[PDB]
Design an enzyme around this catalytic site. Structure first.
Site, PDB file in Angstrom:
ATOM      1  N   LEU A 100      -4.397  -0.005  12.789  1.00 52.93           N
ATOM      2  CA  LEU A 100      -5.536  -0.429  11.962  1.00 52.93           C
ATOM      3  C   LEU A 100      -5.344  -1.918  11.526  1.00 52.93           C
ATOM      4  CD1 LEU A 100      -5.558   2.846   9.693  1.00 52.93           C
ATOM      5  CD2 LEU A 100      -7.259   2.193  11.423  1.00 52.93           C
TER       6      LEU A 100
ATOM      7  N   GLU B 283      -1.919  -5.358  10.524  1.00 53.12           N
ATOM      8  CA  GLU B 283      -0.572  -5.950  10.644  1.00 53.12           C
ATOM      9  C   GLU B 283      -0.223  -7.183   9.728  1.00 53.12           C
ATOM     10  OE1 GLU B 283       0.280  -7.400  14.447  1.00 53.12           O
ATOM     11  OE2 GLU B 283       2.444  -7.525  13.999  1.00 53.12           O
ATOM     12  N   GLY B 284       0.883  -7.108   8.957  1.00 49.72           N
ATOM     13  CA  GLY B 284       1.497  -8.314   8.307  1.00 49.72           C
ATOM     14  C   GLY B 284       2.983  -8.624   8.601  1.00 49.72           C
TER      15      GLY B 284
ATOM     16  N   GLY C 102       5.284  -5.462   8.169  1.00 49.41           N
ATOM     17  CA  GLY C 102       4.875  -4.151   8.785  1.00 49.41           C
ATOM     18  C   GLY C 102       3.513  -4.027   9.497  1.00 49.41           C
ATOM     19  N   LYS C 103       3.299  -2.875  10.113  1.00 47.97           N
ATOM     20  CA  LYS C 103       2.125  -2.513  10.910  1.00 47.97           C
ATOM     21  C   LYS C 103       1.582  -1.294  10.199  1.00 47.97           C
ATOM     22  CE  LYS C 103       2.003  -4.393  15.214  1.00 47.97           C
ATOM     23  NZ  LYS C 103       3.442  -4.426  15.607  1.00 47.97           N
ATOM     24  N   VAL C 104       0.251  -1.162  10.140  1.00 49.64           N
ATOM     25  CA  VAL C 104      -0.382   0.021   9.623  1.00 49.64           C
ATOM     26  C   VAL C 104      -1.043   0.765  10.769  1.00 49.64           C
ATOM     27  CG1 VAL C 104      -1.967   0.904   7.867  1.00 49.64           C
ATOM     28  CG2 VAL C 104      -0.666  -1.231   7.507  1.00 49.64           C
TER      29      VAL C 104
ATOM     30  N   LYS D 123       2.652   3.220   7.213  1.00 50.51           N
ATOM     31  CA  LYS D 123       3.109   1.832   7.195  1.00 50.51           C
ATOM     32  C   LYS D 123       4.484   1.836   7.900  1.00 50.51           C
ATOM     33  CE  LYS D 123       5.073  -1.143   3.731  1.00 50.51           C
ATOM     34  NZ  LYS D 123       4.660  -2.501   4.086  1.00 50.51           N
TER      35      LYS D 123
ATOM     36  N   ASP E 139      -0.121  -8.093  -9.432  1.00 53.51           N
ATOM     37  CA  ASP E 139      -1.110  -8.664  -8.472  1.00 53.51           C
ATOM     38  C   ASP E 139      -2.373  -7.796  -8.478  1.00 53.51           C
ATOM     39  OD1 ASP E 139      -2.311 -10.432  -6.605  1.00 53.51           O
ATOM     40  OD2 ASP E 139      -1.089  -9.709  -4.892  1.00 53.51           O
TER      41      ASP E 139
ATOM     42  N   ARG F 160      -8.800  -6.975  -3.772  1.00 57.63           N
ATOM     43  CA  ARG F 160      -8.013  -6.900  -2.496  1.00 57.63           C
ATOM     44  C   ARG F 160      -6.934  -5.874  -2.478  1.00 57.63           C
ATOM     45  NH1 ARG F 160      -6.717 -11.788  -4.848  1.00 57.63           N
ATOM     46  NH2 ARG F 160      -4.573 -11.698  -5.638  1.00 57.63           N
ATOM     47  N   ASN F 161      -6.379  -5.594  -3.649  1.00 59.33           N
ATOM     48  CA  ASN F 161      -5.309  -4.621  -3.830  1.00 59.33           C
ATOM     49  C   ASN F 161      -5.712  -3.269  -4.395  1.00 59.33           C
ATOM     50  OD1 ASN F 161      -3.255  -6.236  -2.705  1.00 59.33           O
ATOM     51  ND2 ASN F 161      -2.927  -7.340  -4.602  1.00 59.33           N
TER      52      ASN F 161
ATOM     53  N   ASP G 152      -2.114  -1.065  -1.787  1.00 54.10           N
ATOM     54  CA  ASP G 152      -2.158  -2.049  -0.741  1.00 54.10           C
ATOM     55  C   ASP G 152      -0.920  -1.814   0.195  1.00 54.10           C
ATOM     56  OD1 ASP G 152      -0.590  -3.384  -3.176  1.00 54.10           O
ATOM     57  OD2 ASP G 152       0.006  -4.354  -1.189  1.00 54.10           O
TER      58      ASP G 152
HETATM   59  C1  LIG Z   1       7.923  -7.707   0.617  1.00 61.58           C
HETATM   60  C2  LIG Z   1       6.754  -6.703   0.677  1.00 61.58           C
HETATM   61  O1  LIG Z   1       5.725  -7.089  -0.299  1.00 61.58           O
HETATM   62  C3  LIG Z   1       5.033  -5.967  -0.676  1.00 61.58           C
HETATM   63  N1  LIG Z   1       5.258  -4.782  -0.129  1.00 61.58           N
HETATM   64  N2  LIG Z   1       4.442  -3.915  -0.700  1.00 61.58           N
HETATM   65  C4  LIG Z   1       4.471  -2.600  -0.347  1.00 61.58           C
HETATM   66  C5  LIG Z   1       5.672  -1.973  -0.085  1.00 61.58           C
HETATM   67  C6  LIG Z   1       5.674  -0.624   0.289  1.00 61.58           C
HETATM   68  C7  LIG Z   1       4.510   0.138   0.392  1.00 61.58           C
HETATM   69  C8  LIG Z   1       3.309  -0.490   0.199  1.00 61.58           C
HETATM   70  C9  LIG Z   1       3.320  -1.832  -0.158  1.00 61.58           C
HETATM   71  C10 LIG Z   1       3.698  -4.579  -1.670  1.00 61.58           C
HETATM   72  N3  LIG Z   1       2.759  -3.948  -2.373  1.00 61.58           N
HETATM   73  C11 LIG Z   1       3.038  -2.841  -3.103  1.00 61.58           C
HETATM   74  O2  LIG Z   1       4.175  -2.484  -3.416  1.00 61.58           O
HETATM   75  N4  LIG Z   1       1.985  -2.167  -3.607  1.00 61.58           N
HETATM   76  C12 LIG Z   1       2.070  -0.896  -4.305  1.00 61.58           C
HETATM   77  C13 LIG Z   1       1.689   0.229  -3.222  1.00 61.58           C
HETATM   78  N5  LIG Z   1       0.496   0.909  -3.737  1.00 61.58           N
HETATM   79  C14 LIG Z   1       0.276   2.322  -3.273  1.00 61.58           C
HETATM   80  C15 LIG Z   1       0.096   2.400  -1.776  1.00 61.58           C
HETATM   81  O3  LIG Z   1      -1.151   1.887  -1.341  1.00 61.58           O
HETATM   82  C16 LIG Z   1      -1.301   1.685   0.050  1.00 61.58           C
HETATM   83  C17 LIG Z   1       0.608   0.828  -5.213  1.00 61.58           C
HETATM   84  C18 LIG Z   1       1.012  -0.630  -5.405  1.00 61.58           C
HETATM   85  C19 LIG Z   1       1.607  -0.816  -6.693  1.00 61.58           C
HETATM   86  C20 LIG Z   1       1.391   0.103  -7.743  1.00 61.58           C
HETATM   87  C21 LIG Z   1       1.954  -0.115  -9.000  1.00 61.58           C
HETATM   88  C22 LIG Z   1       2.749  -1.263  -9.209  1.00 61.58           C
HETATM   89  F1  LIG Z   1       3.240  -1.491 -10.352  1.00 61.58           F
HETATM   90  C23 LIG Z   1       2.972  -2.164  -8.211  1.00 61.58           C
HETATM   91  F2  LIG Z   1       3.820  -3.231  -8.459  1.00 61.58           F
HETATM   92  C24 LIG Z   1       2.414  -1.936  -6.950  1.00 61.58           C
HETATM   93  C25 LIG Z   1       4.015  -5.863  -1.555  1.00 61.58           C
HETATM   94  C26 LIG Z   1       3.524  -7.024  -2.390  1.00 61.58           C
END
Ligand SMILES: CCOc1nn(-c2ccccc2)c(NC(=O)N[C@@H]2CN(CCOC)C[C@H]2c2ccc(F)c(F)c2)c1C
Ligand code: NA
Length: 302
Positions: free
Chosen positions: A33, A35-36, A39-41, A55, A157, A161-162, A175
């Site tokens: 779906l 890519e960053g 990772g890949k989704v 992910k 953040d 977008r998130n 996200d």
């Molecule tokens: C170096 C990688 O940078 C990042 N990785 N992720 C990440 C990591 C694992 C799973 C999903 C996203 C993120 N984002 C992230 O952690 N978002 C959290 C995942 N989200 C649920 C899955 O939705 C698909 C919730 C979101 C979140 C929720 C509460 C928080 F306090 C928070 F900091 C992030 C960033 C900025």
């Protein structure tokens, strides 16, 4: 790490919380779906039956484990749900519910007064989204944030977008860690690699890197403004540094055209310069949800 929005910037209180491990034979990758950098989704089918978004890890492994242990703590209607990990083989996966409409920013823009197609469909009526629907979106994002504040999490953040939008117009916070690749224009690069969402940040977060439930409230005010503008970038007239200049002087975004004065007052209570003066997210949730469920006769006239 220092990366705002990364779940592992929060403290881990339950170091023994268990993480569900899913067997390889229960997952079937269908296709990519997105890519960053990290990772890949993929869309996948998950069996014991259902579609999931997975992910895949690129490479990190300790971050991966820490992310899964925190994500097992987040179980709420308005947080994108984490079902577990698949670590027998490659890629390593984290498995989440699938959110059919994608990110809320794109959803707003595609159902706004500048959209191409505004035909009625499954989840949305034919025009641009109406008041009652913008209110229901806001309310759901606020509800996810009440949950996070209840559990001492700080997002750092928060932005449209998130968040993700699913079937039935269900809006949840989440996200896949690629917002800096996909929406790099919403970040201000200070370091060689640091990217700050300065247009969503209050002065104390911009200047001191302080992050609390209260800087999250300020961001939620900015989210409200994004919802009522159908996804416009805050301070879109301004460069990054000029926006910093605005935010710092104490200037406030203007009332959007689709925003009633009652809703603007809510935004404003999130934008007090002093963090302890800002409204509580529980009160913002309560008011928005009450408005979303108000009689149409009342909402028609706001
Ligand atoms: C170096 C990688 O940078 C990042 N990785 N992720 C990440 C990591 C694992 C799973 C999903 C996203 C993120 N984002 C992230 O952690 N978002 C959290 C995942 N989200 C649920 C899955 O939705 C698909 C919730 C979101 C979140 C929720 C509460 C928080 F306090 C928070 F900091 C992030 C960033 C900025
Ligand atoms: Na914050």
């Amino acid at each position: 790490s220092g990366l705002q929005g990364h779940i592992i910037e929060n403290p881990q209180y339950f170091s023994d919380a268990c993480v569900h491990h899913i067997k390889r034979r229960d997952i079937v990758l269908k296709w990519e779906l997105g890519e960053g950098a990290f990772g890949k989704v993929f869309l996948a089918e998950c069996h014991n039956k259902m579609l999931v978004a997975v992910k895949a890890l690129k490479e990190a492994r300790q971050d991966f484990q820490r992310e899964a242990e925190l994500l097992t703590m987040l179980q709420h209607q308005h947080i994108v749900r984490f079902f577990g990990v698949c670590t027998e083989g490659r890629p390593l996966l984290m498995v989440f519910e699938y959110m059919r409409h994608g990110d809320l920013n794109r959803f707003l823009r595609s159902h706004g007064p500048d959209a191409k197609l505004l035909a009625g469909g499954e989840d949305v009526a034919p025009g641009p989204l109406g008041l009652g629907q913008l209110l229901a979106v806001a309310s759901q994002v606020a509800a996810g944030m009440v949950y996070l504040a209840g559990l001492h999490f700080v997002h750092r953040d928060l932005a449209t977008r998130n968040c993700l939008v699913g079937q039935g117009l269900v809006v949840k916070i989440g996200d896949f860690g690629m917002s800096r690749d996909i929406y790099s224009t919403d970040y201000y690069r200070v370091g060689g690699r640091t990217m700050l969402p300065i247009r969503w940040m209050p002065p104390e977060s911009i200047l001191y890197r302080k992050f609390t439930t209260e800087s999250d409230v300020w961001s939620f005010g900015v989210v409200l403004w994004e919802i009522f503008t159908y996804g416009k970038q805050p301070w879109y007239q301004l460069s990054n540094t000029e926006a910093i200049d605005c935010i710092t002087q104490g200037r406030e975004l203007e009332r959007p055209r689709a925003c009633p004065p009652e809703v603007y007052a809510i935004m404003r209570g999130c934008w007090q310069r002093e963090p302890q003066q800002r409204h509580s997210i529980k009160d913002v949730h309560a008011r928005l949800q009450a408005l979303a469920q108000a009689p149409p006769v009342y909402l028609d006239v706001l």
